[PDB]
């Protein structure tokens, strides 16, 4: 357990993955979750209606993704500028702040 | 309570299990923010009488 | 105390055309379906045509082509119109409606009077 | 997966005699000479599979049966068989598999899966079944189970996923090994015991018969509109008649009427010609519908009207009905209007003066008995009513029953339906006030219609199921939270759950209640945090905190 | 205080910790300069 | 005014937390806010219609409440390991760096 | 089962009742053919960005 850090971020980002493809197969509230079954077992214009709530949900969930995404890198950052600070003060020179 | 709700709710996929995943990450969190910031001696150290 | 009616029947030519009118009151609420049976002398009655509350018609071997059954938007008024008449089509039709009997609306079943389709 | 299994652990009958077929059979037989042959199913006891010497019947019939030894017919200790039954969506599924034992006069210890064997498309309700010939019954019910499948696809090994504490920790986490800590499993709540349902003790049924049986209908320009208050509204004598030609309700279902609770109830009265009828709903255009009767477009109530014919007729037709046909204005909703001013059409004013550029207002109906139904007179109600969460003075017929206190129980005070535990208050209401409620417009309290007494409502208790563990690869031990209960009020598979219900190892934290650990005076580095400064660890072989 | 699905867990410290904490670093502090911070 | 920051967290806190409780008492296009009276008042079919509708409602303002949270936290965090920072180095050391 | 995609041959061996694989995703990657009764791996239609 010496390099739980470096995992951790591997973890999250393949975990966010496999929830965004299972989301695939959730019908949101349809007749079925494959676009195929709605365009043979119906007409246009009511499958219409059964289309658009398919992307409905299928954008929120996309857009969930992409939020958790935009705050993760947040905080990878952080850690990068204190890399390189460290690198800067501890590596290059002898410091003097303590710990 | 509901179970008509319960079942109409089992189509939208796994939302509820993600949000209680991330506030539960939130809660986690703020042990180890105490703990970095007051947690720095090794011992108990004690003023004379 | 009679819930249904038959209308627009008549004499005429074989070839002719005529046009029939069952009209009920509140069809409108009561979303059931309607029937146009036929009884013509000799043997016992026979179903004509069918129409439901989203408008899938239905008719009869002998009068799909020139027989067409419509139903108004309102009103609550329907048609058959009758063409291409022939002398054997002189017989009594009757209508058959659905009304509400414990809250749900299409329980109890009707058929009305019937009206005399005479072609020559 | 989700499916009906066999639960593990559990009593299999013994057989060395007719059963039921509740959802699926685990048959199971280990022999050495054959003396078993096949099954018999069916409900009035249906088909039959047999093997004699080497060929195998499997015929459904109608048959002759204290057995011993046609719509399809598909002809063709050393020794344990296991077959599993069951019949979905009318196909009849058997899987099946072959082992060698050697041992006596009981179950093996061991798993092995069972592959398909055969489907067969009958299509019969099956309840009852009986065998042909040491053998062993079971039961199958909805479960979920974790599969494990090796290399080559064979399923090696499974959890029950509701057995204990421990394999639902395993199931949350899709893994067969649990590392050392704290896991959050599932959810707890209390479950009410009664119902409870109180009403006022009025009995006058409200006076229906009067409205509906009436003697002279008022004419539409001038509709006759009467409150409803203050009596049991059974509906069931509406229920029952059968000569109605509409009765359609709007923001609720018709059938349903007799179990709700309204504040103001309102009864219209009028008659119309049949032709008419259908302007009588909301959004609907024409001259009744502006400027006689206008109906809102958010309407909640019921129409009913039926036909008159034999009751509303002059020799020559009556004429004392009347209506509006000529006004400056439409009829907003729920507007009457009988004023008596000539219209006027052209552009000089009429001083009531009637004939050119003016016109009377009204005009009148002649039911003369003999018309088509589209000019015969329909008689009209309209029942109208508010449906608020309130006192709701109007309420159907229902039977109240006693109070019960300080038990989570399932309430309903006049409409006020809801669920929680009900104690004696110490508020002061006032002689005009029926309930109260907190910062949040929650319900949380109400006054007794029976004995005017105020009650406070707390809801039934609930929390999270926590599960502590060293890891597996040191233990199969467990101790179990419960999140901010009291553990007076904890109470499942008895040999597995109920042990982490009651016990001498009952614990009470500042963070729940903890099941299964013991509470030593010592005090070390913490290991894992159960919380408000208190840890558990393993140490010396049990779990303490 | 009332509750549709919402919980308060407590922290793992308490304040007396909290403050125990405290008053360790202020002693060393006071008896022993800097140099508890890098060795004994 | 003196400790104004720690009274901004919690007033930021148990508001954000007030308005979650009370968007439970909107329609959102419903005939009702509450579930056991549109159960008590019509057949499943549309039920069914009404209750989708609340269902929507009230699970977008979840989403939006823990977003805020979740941007919140990396404050809080921020801030922490700023004062972590302070007590090594100006606690059990002495600095030089200005201010 | 239909779909889309590049058909090949593969040596991954079912068992005599299997029909078609899965992945961890859960998404079908392999299918036995009806009549010769070999094993196809299945894989996605090439593409990208420019
Ligand atoms: C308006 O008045 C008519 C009067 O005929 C009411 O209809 C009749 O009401 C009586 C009273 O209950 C019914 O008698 C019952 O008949 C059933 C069999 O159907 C029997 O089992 C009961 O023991 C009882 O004798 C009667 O059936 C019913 N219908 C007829 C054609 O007479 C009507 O209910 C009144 N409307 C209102 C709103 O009060
Ligand atoms: C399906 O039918 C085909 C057509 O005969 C079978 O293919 C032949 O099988 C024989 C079996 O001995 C081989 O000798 C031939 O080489 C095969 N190919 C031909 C004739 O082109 C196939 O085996 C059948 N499969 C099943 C499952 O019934
Ligand atoms: C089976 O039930 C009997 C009581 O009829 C008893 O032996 C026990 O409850 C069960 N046996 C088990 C669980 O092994
Ligand atoms: C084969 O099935 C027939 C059908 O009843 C049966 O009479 C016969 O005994 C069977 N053959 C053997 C060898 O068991
Ligand atoms: C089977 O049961 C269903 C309902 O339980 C019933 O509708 C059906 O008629 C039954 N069929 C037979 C063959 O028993
Ligand atoms: C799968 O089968 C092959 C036989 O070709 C065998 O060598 C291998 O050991 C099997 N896989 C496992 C996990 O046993
Ligand atoms: C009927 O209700 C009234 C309402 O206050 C109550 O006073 C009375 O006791 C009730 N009847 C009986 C028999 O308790
Ligand atoms: C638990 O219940 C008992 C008895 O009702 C009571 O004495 C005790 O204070 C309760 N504990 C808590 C934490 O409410
Ligand atoms: C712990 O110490 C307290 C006070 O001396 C005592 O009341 C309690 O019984 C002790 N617990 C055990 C398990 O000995």
Known sequence: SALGKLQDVVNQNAQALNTLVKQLSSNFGAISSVLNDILSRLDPPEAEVQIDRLITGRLQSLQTYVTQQLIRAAEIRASANLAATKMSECVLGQSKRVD | DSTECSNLLLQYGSFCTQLNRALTGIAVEQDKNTQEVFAQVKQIYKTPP | ?120 | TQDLFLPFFSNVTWFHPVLPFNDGVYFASTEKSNIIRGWIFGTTLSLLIVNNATNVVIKVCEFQFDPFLCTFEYVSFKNLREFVFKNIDGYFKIYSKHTPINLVRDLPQGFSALEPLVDLPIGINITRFQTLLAYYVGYLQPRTFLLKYNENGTITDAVDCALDPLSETKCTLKSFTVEKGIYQTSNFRVQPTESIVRFPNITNLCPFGEVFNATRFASVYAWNRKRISNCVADYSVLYNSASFSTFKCYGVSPTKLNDLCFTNVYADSFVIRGDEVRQIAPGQTGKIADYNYKLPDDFTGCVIAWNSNNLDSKVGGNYNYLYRLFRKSNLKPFERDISTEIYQAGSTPCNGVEGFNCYFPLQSYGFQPTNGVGYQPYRVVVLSFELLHAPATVCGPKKSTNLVKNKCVNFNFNGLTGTGVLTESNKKFLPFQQFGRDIADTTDAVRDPQTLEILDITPCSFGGVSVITPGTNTSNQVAVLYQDVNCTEVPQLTPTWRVYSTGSNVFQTRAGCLIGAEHVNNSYECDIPIGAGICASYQTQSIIA | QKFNGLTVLPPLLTDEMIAQYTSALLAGTITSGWTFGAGP
Not at chain 3, 35 to 62: L, M, N
Request: aromatic share 10%; proline share 3%.
């Open chain 3, 1 to 120: 105390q009679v819930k249904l009616e038959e209308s627009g029947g008549g004499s005429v030519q074989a070839g002719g055309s005529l046009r029939l009118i069952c009209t009920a009151p509140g069809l409108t609420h009561n979303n059931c379906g309607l029937d146009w049976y036929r009884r013509a002398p000799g043997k016992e009655r026979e179903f004509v045509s069918s129409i439901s509350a989203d408008g899938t018609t239905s008719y009869a071997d002998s009068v799909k082509g020139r027989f067409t059954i419509s139903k108004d938007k309102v009103e609550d008024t329907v048609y058959l119109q009758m063409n291409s008449l022939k002398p054997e089509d002189t017989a009594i039709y009757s209508c058959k409606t659905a009304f509400p009997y414990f809250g749900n609306s299409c329980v109890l079943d009707y058929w009305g009077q019937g009206t005399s389709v005479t072609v020559s």
